[PDB]
Amino acid sequence: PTPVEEAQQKTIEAITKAINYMAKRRIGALLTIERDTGMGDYIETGIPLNAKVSSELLINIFIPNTPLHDGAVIMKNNEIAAAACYLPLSESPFISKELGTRHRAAVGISEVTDSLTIIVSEETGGVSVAKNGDLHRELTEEALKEMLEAE
């Protein structure tokens, strides 16, 4: 593999490891990966990090009752750009009714960007992905990895 390919796989592995840890403990999480549509306006609402990705840092960001856990992490160019970012809340009437603002925020950003957002539910530990205005719920580990690799 090239250097770029190895870096992308390392980042996918760090993400999946962090998501698995948080799903097991039912830690709510919101992680948006910027793609072709620029998201600087939303990145600027959070706490700047421009940090290297690691499963450890992702976990430490989302610990409940900490400064950085409320809001979205936004990743860009293989780094964590910022944490505690605002995302717009979807008004879609087709989101499962039992879901709260975390999932609505993920769907909302997915309606106006080509980004991929991962959500961990604090109620169930379920893992979902928002893209193109739709929420893909109750994902297995393999399903999330396939989505990240496809993206």
Place this chain on the structure above:
Amino acid sequence: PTPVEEAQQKTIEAITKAINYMAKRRIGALLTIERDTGMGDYIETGIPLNAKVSSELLINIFIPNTPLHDGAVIMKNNEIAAAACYLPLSESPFISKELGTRHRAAVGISEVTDSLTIIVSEETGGVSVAKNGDLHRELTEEALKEMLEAE
């Protein structure tokens, strides 16, 4: 002031805010600020972050029972270079016998570098600084800030 001086002031403000927060909550912390003696060998033992400084990130790093809380954070200028770093343990007899590994690690790195290390005790919330092989304990918020500004 110059941009360099303003950046230094912002970093000092972020450090002091985080240390004060952690001291009040008895959150143990070990934070080494690299100076003119390079500490790459110790930075490379931890988890790379290369992240912009913020009080929020510093606090999140040291939350107990998290991946990044054990070991030292090492700062380079205005960045958090790495977390969970190893530091050498001092054998100095002038370390209070009741103090644990964080304080001995801080004095240890201060014996082989010109760095300044801040320690928060998880037992008492007391704040101490290690520099040039000496540990100065029970610092007030004002004393810590003055030491950082003088550094």
